[PDB]
Each structure stands twice: as structure tokens, then as C-alpha cells.
Design a protein around this ligand. Structure first.
Ligand SMILES: Nc1ncnc2c1ncn2[C@@H]1O[C@H](COP(=O)(O)OP(=O)(O)OP(=O)(O)O)[C@@H](O)[C@H]1O
Ligand SMILES: Nc1ncnc2c1ncn2[C@@H]1O[C@H](COP(=O)(O)OP(=O)(O)O)[C@@H](O)[C@H]1O
Lengths: 735, 386
């Protein structure tokens, strides 16, 4: 009449040898309830994956509670049975006929063992059960040379009539003291892909977030694995760790990895499934879960999508499951354990939407922020992804990986995994369409399909606060050497003369203004400065921050400033400042005025941002608000006017590099002298038009000639006027 | 919150006894910290009485739960620092020191979530340059309320508690408030004007109410505002109803059927005619300070202070001719001029022990004052009119 509904997994105590494969510590009343002979096999439903692991059952010592059962750490590792998964009990199936091959794998080793083998077979199949496709055991102690070596039995080739059997157990019959067919030791194979058993993913797969990996590692074995060290102080440890970030960064894989790498018990909740009409049912279930977690000392609490569980006070008073759950959780996790060893892992998308009561140092003093991967993190993720398939399935140079990582600016780890998925999809479909079902292993992975994958993916993260732009070197620079020296000195000041500024008190103006023609010499110079200086660069556009909603721009600016300050000293540049500075002249809304005041009082107000450098480039400086153009901030002014003769010559040579200068007959001087002052953008447009005219004649051309240049010069006008130059000069002299 | 309680329960026939446990003051916080340290005993830490007193004084608005959180986070920081540096040394060897506590209280953010009356840094008198009349009025308005309460009570003068600070931007308008926060030693609180505006509607009003209640319960203090020129103008320029609500709430707090004798409110403004007529009424913001550009002596002092790092004797400058020539500038203008001169000196041969006269002349020629006489005439007209 016990009627056991669900079961809990628990490691076999006392270690030693005992049974170690067929412990099966199930209380005798549960054995009698199922009407199955104890001296037979048993299955652990583990909510799915029918067939399970038919393992000989036994009995406990009447001290083991009904809820928890023992399935041995070997089976735990084989089936990826994490301590805390819900389990069900089912009757045994038909016995298998026999075993055929059984072959070891010798994981994390170079194989060729002989010396420390010492007849593993006797100890390999001296135990009852021993399922031939899966086993993991401790190194124990073989002769001298200590160390740790594990044996795995991955590959399997036996045939079973019922396909329901996931791991097709087989009988054991060995000969020894203290042989199957054709020995067992053969080659160092990995997990077989024919069956594709689940793998215990570790921190090796996760890449690009190692810096926070150490932080979470400290957070997980300060309280848990070293309780005495913290208890020696007696101030109680925090019971909650908050994880937050944009979706797709990989929090769940990470929490899954940190749960798998720990042998302690873990608790997982579906979330909204707990929500029910009954008021006290949820309270009783949560109290029972907390009591079960407290009963066994090693326990970890996982709370996913906690934002819905804990809404903010002012956001909405929806009803039903509401703040009562938050209050009872607070009173629970702050009430039972003094020292203990308990941590609650909370995963949320938007920290602001989370209850501020939860976000308090009293209980959630540990905050984890997982930002989108940068160039280095994305490169690491791609390298790990391709190393997963290894060189047998594909060939790609590291230069191609670096180029792809540079091209992918706003992609996330999930986005990169997807990108690989449709790259494989494109390869498969192209092979099927063209080769007509040839062996596609030789085709493997190339660059064209991957480029088409970036073309057709269209990631949903286009609207992002972090942006990257293609990088150019000093060769692409067209400008005067005076401004080049000025900006070189400006960038070299904080990076090198920081101690000189500290001792002399000069500090840094941390403000640069670049007023010039709208043609060029601002964005390209910023690109090259970011490329060469090696400092983190953030591209912020004027109209981009402007949207229909009022106040979102201020919040976004505050967030980007905060994370730029906390993300090491980096330079901040705004593409267009004239779209927000004029407020009185343009009768701008209150949002623009608030943004302007916030930037004014954050650049050089109440606090000093010595580490970061602020540089601004815009046009028509006289239309901006006088508040921004105040002495003390953004004092530096650069003329950055039209390019000189050398700059235009270099730009024309770079544009003509694909062409034959000697065959065209141009001296690279007269054209620049004629088009000396219009702009660089019109020079690029003229070069493009000349190339189009050249290729119009007979498709591909090996030269550009001079008639095309003359036609491009005649057809394209200038668009520049002396009055804007006079206005710029008047502004320059008045400052 | 007793307000959310049903008034039926809040009745003398039902709940005539009310027990209120307010925010702990300095003495209560010190007592709580001493009790907590006595609880974990001297084996695990070494703290002196003056250290506990300093910690309690620094935590002006923290609560007992906040103090416990501070101690806990200091414990984690000490443990992680010991693990990182000492490589698993004995726990009792490192115990608890003061630097980890200071770092913890710096990083924890103050108790008031998203507060607006921030704790701005302090700076000593010899680092302050300005006219002596403003300093005299400074000493006036601080010496009267602190040690003239009995005189006001016997004479009926009371406390006007209203001072308006109007002047050109960038020249010692907030310097007086900073020097006051340094010298007075009373718990100082400052608000950036535009920071009161937020996307949410109604949050500013409740934040203002709660911070005013905290100021009232946090002993007689002084309240200063940085830039009231963003919220005061509502009729001169277009504004939403939130600004009008903030203005009327501030008016009610200042002089609406309530009086705050303990605290003194001072407002600093950039544009003098953008203050609303209702706010600019007799009885509130009565005192007006010109606080104009610094005089010759203040500019000379600022120049000497900036040149103090350099070698003034062998540089050849008398520190007076340059100040006389630089008469149309202000304190910030002189500071940036000295910074540019230092930059020009260091860009030649890296480290320099002085600044040359030619570099100073070039910097002066390159930079402009940026101040127009018409704005000064406008300020004079406002002063005569008020
Ligand atoms: N750093 C990473 N290393 C390895 N895999 C990653 C990484 N970041 C993301 N992934 C991949 O992301 C996929 C999904 O991640 P997951 O669903 O856990 O995201 P999440 O960030 O928790 O979700 P969301 O932010 O949308 O709530 C997994 O298949 C995982 O392999
Ligand atoms: N002796 C000094 N040396 C360097 N900087 C100073 C000195 N005195 C004041 N400052 C700076 O000048 C600023 C004065 O602010 P202020 O111009 O009064 O504000 P507002 O712009 O509202 O008028 C302070 O933020 C302070 O950092």
C-alpha cells in the first residue's frame, strides 16, 4: 500500500567493492509492491529513454529510505544520471542471450599499456552485470607508478532483437583467478557514433568565458567542497548565486556542465509546471523539496527562468502565483541553514525585471554577468567547435577561423553553433544537387558553404548594444601628418604617461573633438586607430540610439558606459553627435535633453573617468548646444580638413592596386592635382565608376586606361562649396 | 509599511499601542557592530574601538542587515584574497583586517537602492580658491544654524533655510558646496539636477519623499542641489506634467504646511531666469550669492597650485604677471590652460620638471576664454532685479 510514485538517485555508500554494479538498495516493501523477484533485473525509469539498464536487484539494510536508491557511480557515469533526476520503477525484461566482442577504449591515454594492464579481464568481469557498451571505474592501484587511468568500453557490436533496449546488456563468462572471443584489448576508440550515448560535457567544450569560469569555480567550492574553512569564521555563507545575461550565451549548458562535473546532489525544477490553482500545493511541494535538499548535506539548487517566478513589485500585480512564493523562498533559504553547504543557482534574462528584493547582498551578493563573446571568445568557440569534429571530418586553416571570427561581430555561441549547422546543411545540399550522391566525406567543410551560411542566417541579434566594424591598417589612412601625430600623442598619453600625469597632476582632458567634411577622414581613422592601438572599441551611432520610446536611450547609454568602465580602459567613440546635441535650436524632446545632461555630468561630473578616453567626430559644430561645447571637457579640437596631395595619391594608388598603373598610362599625380580638394568619398566613387566603365566594354579587363578616368571625372561633380570651408575656418579661429 | 495596513486594524480600540523601529543611527550601528564582533569573538578577528567607530561613521545609512552583509562579503573577500596570495595559509593567520572591509563597503553600493543624494568626495581648504565674500557668507550660513538655535528661539529669527546660488557656469559654483561638505563634517548629500528625471512616471516623487524622510531621520544635515536649471523651467519651455509635479512637491516640502529647521536646503542654478516664479518666492531661496568669476587673488592661487608640481623658481615666471594677463578667464579655464601647458611641455622630451614661458604663451594663444560679456550683463540685470 506504499504506492511509490517517484524515486531519487543516491551514490553507493562506503565505496569498497561490495556490489558496485548491482547495489540496488530498494526497500523490501517496494520490492513486494512490484511483485518481482529480488534476485532479478530491475529498471530505473528516469522519466524517459525506455529500456533503461537491466541490472540485478538486491536488498538494503532497512536504514536506507525508500525515496533514494543506489545505482552505482559506474552506471551514473554511463547513463549520465545526474544526482537529482526523477526516477520510476519498472519490471525487468527478457534476459539477453550472450556477449560477442567487448572491446576496451582506454580513455584519456596514449594506449599501449601492457605493463600496468596486469590481467584487467579478471577484475573487468569479476563483477555482476558489467554492461558491455558502458563502464567507468576508478584507477584503483596496479603495480607501481601510481597515477590515475580510467578504462572505458565504448564500442559495441552485439545484436539484440528488441530495439527498445538502449544499451543491450550481455552475459559475462570469463576464465581466470584472483575470455570472450579474440581478446578484448583493441585500439583507443572514442564513444561509438552508431549508438551515440549521451556524454558528460565538461568545461573543455565551453570556451571564451574562462575568466568567469574561474569565478563560478570559486563560487562553487568555497561553500560546498570546503565548508570547514568558511565555518571557521562563523558569518554564514551566501545561499544564492545569480546568473544573468542575453539569451543564447549558454547559461543552461554551463549550469548543466557545472552540475555534471560535481558528484553532489542537485535539484532542478521545470518552473511554470509547479504553478497550479491550489494555493498551498506549491508551498508544500517547495517546502518538501527544500527539506529533502537539507536532509542530505551535499545539495545544489537550480532555479531556471526565475524572472517569471519572481516578478518586480511595480511592473505588474498579475496575481495567482505571486509575491507569496518570493516571501516563502526568502524565509526558507534564510531560515534553516546557518553554515551548511547549500547554493541556489538562479538564471534570468533581464536582471532589472527581477525582483530588487532578491538582488540584495544579504542573499544574492554574488552576481554573474555573461556578455556576448568578443573576437577572441568567438575565435576560441569556433576553434573548440572544429576541434570537436577534428581533422578527419574536415580541414580548415586557423587563418580561416580567425577571418570568420572577425567577420562574425554580433554572433553568440548559439548563433555560431547554428551557423555551423547550416554550413553543414549547405554542404550536404550542394553535394546532393551536384555530385549526385557521391561519398560526401571527401567533400567535408569548405569556405563557400560557410560564407553562404553567414549570408542566409540573418541573425536576430542585429539590434545590439555592442557593435564591431571591419579593421584597416595605416595603409588605408588618407590624411595630413600633423593630425596623425596629434592623435598618436593623444592615444599615447593615457596608455604610457599615466604615472607622469599622476606625479605632475596634469591628468588627461579625456575629450577629443573632430570637426571636418562629411566625406571621410573620421570613420576610417577611427577604424585604423582601433586596429592599431589594440584597445577595445565601441561603435555608437547617433540615430541608432534614438527610437520611439522615451528614456530607453538614457538607460542604454548608462549601461554601455558602466560596462565599458568595468570592461578595462577602452576608448568610446560616437559616429554622429549632431543628431542629439542640438536641443534648443531644434526644439528636441525631453529625452534628448536628458541624454545630453547625463553625458555632460558623466564625462567630467562628480566622477573622473581617467582610464577611458572619449573622442567625438561630427560636422557643423555651431549647431550643437553650448553646454557640451564648454571649457574643461572636449577641449581638444582637430581641423581634420580635406586630405593633402600625399593622402589622395595614397588613396588613388590603393584603389588602383587591382589595376595596372603602368598600362593605364596615368602618372598618379595629375589626377590628384585636378581633384585635389573635393573629398575622398567622391574619389572612391570615381574609381568605382571608372572600373564599371572599363568592365562595360568586354566584361573582364586587365587594365583601366585613361579614357575611363576622364569620363568618370567629367560625369561626376564635386558637391563641395567654399562657404562651408569658410564657416569651418571661422569656427576654428573663434575657438 | 503602516500605510498599506487596513485602517480598521489601525484603531485605538484595536491597535492603540504602536512600536516603531527606526533606522539605526551612528550609536546603534556601533553597538550592533561591537555586539557582532563580540559574538564571533577575538579569535577570528582583531578590531579596535576606533576602527569600529570609523566604520559606523562611514555607514551613515546602513542597517543591521546591511552591516551583517558587509561583514559577510568582507569575509568572502578575505578568504579569496588569502587563497589567491598566501596559497592556502592558516585561516586564523590572516583573520580579519580593515582594508577588506573598506573595499567591501566601497563595492557593495550604499544601502539606498538607486539613491540620488550621493556622497561626493571631499577636499581640503588650501585646495580651494575663490573670493573671501563667498567664504564669509559660507561661514555665516553654517555658524548660524549649528550654534544659534537658542538665539533663534529666543529672538524669533528661526531659520530661513533658503539660499540660492546663481552665477556663470564652471567658476566655483559647486566648489563652495564641496568645501562645505569637507569642512562641516555633517552628513552631506548632493543631487544632480537632471538625475531626478527617469523613464518611469511617479518613481521620482516617491524617491524624493523617501530620501527626504531619510534626511529628516538622519539628524540635522545640509541638502544641496547641483543643477536645478533642468527641473525649474516649466513655463519658459515645454515640459511634461512630471516636472510640474516635482516642482510642486519640492515647494510643499520646503514651505508647504511643514518646516524643516534641522536641515538646510541650498540650490545652485546656472540660468537665473529659468527658476519658476512659485519656487522663487519670499521665504524660500531668499539668500542670493553672486559667486561670479574668481578675482585676481584666486586666479593667482590657482596658478601657483598648478605650478607647484613644476619648479617655479627656475622656470622664470613670477606667478603674478601671468595671472594679471589671464584676467578674463576663470578657475576651470586656468586649470585647463595649465593642463595644456603641461601637455605641451611633456610632448617635447617626455618627462619635464617645469613648464616653459613660451609653452604657456602658446597655450594661452591657442585657447579662448569662452565667456561673453552679455551673459555677465544678464547676470547683473538679474541681480539688480532680485
Ligand atoms: N560558451 C559556450 N560554450 C559552448 N556552448 C555554448 C556556449 N555558449 C552557448 N553555447 C551553446 O548554446 C546552446 C544553447 O545554450 P542555452 O540554451 O543554455 O542558453 P542560455 O544563455 O542559457 O539561454 P537564454 O539566454 O536564451 O535564456 C547550447 O547548445 C550550447 O552548446
Ligand atoms: N583646486 C582645484 N583643482 C582642480 N580642480 C578643481 C579645484 N577646485 C575645483 N575643482 C573642480 O572644479 C569643479 C567645480 O564645479 P563647478 O564649476 O562649481 O560646477 P558648475 O559647473 O555647476 O558651476 C569641481 O567638480 C572640481 O572637480
Amino acid at each position: 500500500f506504499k504506492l511509490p510514485a517517484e524515486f531519487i538517485t543516491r551514490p553507493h555508500p562506503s565505496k569498497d567493492h561490495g556490489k558496485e554494479t548491482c547495489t540496488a538498495y530498494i526497500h523490501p516493501n517496494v520490492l513486494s509492491s512490484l511483485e518481482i523477484n529480488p534476485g532479478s533485473f530491475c529498471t530505473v525509469g528516469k522519466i524517459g529513454e525506455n529500456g533503461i539498464l537491466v541490472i540485478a536487484r538486491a536488498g538494503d539494510e532497512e536504514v536506507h529510505p525508500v525515496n533514494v536508491i543506489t545505482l552505482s557511480t559506474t552506471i551514473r557515469s554511463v547513463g549520465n544520471l545526474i544526482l537529482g533526476d526523477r526516477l520510476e520503477l519498472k519490471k525487468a525484461q527478457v534476459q539477453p542471450p550472450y556477449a560477442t566482442k567487448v572491446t576496451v577504449g582506454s580513455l584519456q591515454g596514449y594506449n599501449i599499456l601492457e605493463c600496468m594492464e596486469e590481467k584487467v579481464i579478471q577484475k573487468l568481469l569479476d563483477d555482476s552485470g558489467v554492461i558491455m557498451p558502458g563502464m567507468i571505474f576508478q584507477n584503483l592501484k596496479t603495480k607501481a607508478g601510481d597515477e590515475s587511468i580510467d578504462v572505458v568500453i565504448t564500442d559495441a557490436s552485439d545484436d539484440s532483437l528488441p530495439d527498445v533496449s538502449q544499451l543491450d546488456l550481455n552475459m559475462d563468462d570469463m576464465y581466470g583467478g584472483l575470455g570472450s572471443t579474440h581478446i578484448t584489448f583493441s585500439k583507443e576508440t572514442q564513444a561509438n557514433r552508431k549508438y551515440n550515448l549521451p556524454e558528460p560535457l565538461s568545461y573543455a567544450a565551453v570556451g571564451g568565458l574562462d575568466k568567469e569560469i574561474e569565478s563560478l569555480k570559486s563560487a562553487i567550492e568555497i561553500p560546498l567542497h570546503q565548508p570547514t574553512l568558511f565555518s571557521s569564521f562563523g558569518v554564514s555563507p551566501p545561499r544564492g548565486i545569480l546568473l544573468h545575461g542575453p539569451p543564447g550565451t549558454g547559461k543552461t549548458m554551463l549550469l548543466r556542465v557545472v552540475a555534471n562535473t560535481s558528484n553532489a546532489h542537485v535539484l532542478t525544477i521545470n518552473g511554470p509546471s509547479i504553478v497550479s490553482k491550489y494555493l498551498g500545493e506549491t508551498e508544500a511541494a517547495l517546502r518538501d523539496i527544500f527539506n529533502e535538499a537539507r536532509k542530505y548535506q551535499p545539495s545544489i539548487i537550480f532555479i531556471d527562468e526565475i524572472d517569471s517566478i519572481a516578478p518586480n513589485r511595480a511592473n505588474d500585480d498579475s496575481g495567482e502565483v505571486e509575491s507569496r512564493v518570493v516571501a516563502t523562498l526568502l524565509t526558507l533559504m534564510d531560515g534553516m541553514g546557518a553554515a551548511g553547504k547549500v547554493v541556489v543557482i538562479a538564471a534570468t534574462n533581464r536582471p532589472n525585471s527581477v525582483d530588487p528584493a532578491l538582488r540584495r547582498p544579504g542573499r544574492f551578493d554574488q552576481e554573474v554577468e555573461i556578455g556576448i563573446p568578443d573576437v577572441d571568445a568567438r575565435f576560441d568557440i569556433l576553434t573548440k567547435q572544429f576541434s570537436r569534429m577534428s581533422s578527419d571530418r574536415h580541414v580548415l586553416d586557423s587563418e580561416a577561423i580567425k577571418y570568420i571570427a572577425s567577420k562574425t561581430h554580433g554572433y553568440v555561441g548559439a548563433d555560431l553553433t547554428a551557423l555551423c549547422r547550416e554550413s553543414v546543411m549547405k554542404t550536404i545540399q550542394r553535394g546532393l544537387g551536384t555530385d549526385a550522391n557521391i561519398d560526401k566525406f571527401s567533400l567535408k567543410v569548405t569556405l563557400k558553404d560557410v560564407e553562404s551560411a553567414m549570408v542566409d542566417i540573418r541573425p536576430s541579434a542585429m539590434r545590439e548594444i555592442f557593435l564591431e566594424m571591419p579593421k584597416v591598417y595605416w595603409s588605408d589612412i588618407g590624411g595630413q601628418e600633423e593630425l596623425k601625430t596629434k592623435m598618436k600623442e593623444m592615444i599615447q598619453l593615457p596608455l604610457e604617461a599615466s604615472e607622469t600625469f599622476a606625479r605632475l597632476g596634469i591628468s588627461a582632458p579625456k575629450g577629443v573633438l573632430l570637426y571636418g567634411p562629411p566625406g571621410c577622414s573620421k570613420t576610417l581613422t577611427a577604424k585604423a586607430l582601433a586596429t592599431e592601438s589594440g584597445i577595445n572599441f565601441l561603435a555608437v551611432k547617433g540615430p541608432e540610439i534614438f527610437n520611439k520610446y522615451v528614456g530607453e536611450s538614457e538607460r542604454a547609454i548608462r549601461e554601455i558606459f558602466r560596462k565599458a568602465r568595468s570592461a578595462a580602459p577602452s576608448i568610446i567613440f560616437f559616429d554622429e553627435i549632431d543628431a542629439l546635441s542640438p536641443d534648443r535650436d531644434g526644439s528636441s524632446t525631453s529625452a534628448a535633453n536628458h541624454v545630453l545632461t547625463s553625458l555632460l555630468n558623466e564625462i567630467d561630473g562628480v566622477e573622473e573617468l581617467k582610464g577611458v578616453v572619449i573622442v567625438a567626430a561630427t560636422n557643423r559644430p555651431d549647431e550643437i548646444d553650448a553646454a557640451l561645447l564648454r571649457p574643461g571637457r572636449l577641449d581638444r579640437h582637430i581641423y581634420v580638413g580635406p586630405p593633402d596631395v600625399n593622402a589622395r595619391l595614397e588613396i588613388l594608388k590603393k584603389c588602383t592596386k587591382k589595376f595596372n598603373t603602368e598600362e593605364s598610362g596615368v602618372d598618379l599625380h595629375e589626377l590628384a592635382d585636378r581633384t585635389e580638394g573635393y573629398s575622398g568619398a567622391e574619389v572612391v566613387l570615381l574609381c568605382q565608376e571608372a572600373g564599371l566603365a572599363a568592365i562595360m566594354e568586354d566584361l573582364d579587363v586587365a587594365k583601366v586606361e585613361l579614357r575611363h578616368f576622364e569620363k568618370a571625372f567629367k560625369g561626376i561633380a564635386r558637391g563641395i562649396t567654399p562657404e562651408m570651408l569658410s564657416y569651418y575656418e571661422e569656427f576654428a579661429l573663434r575657438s
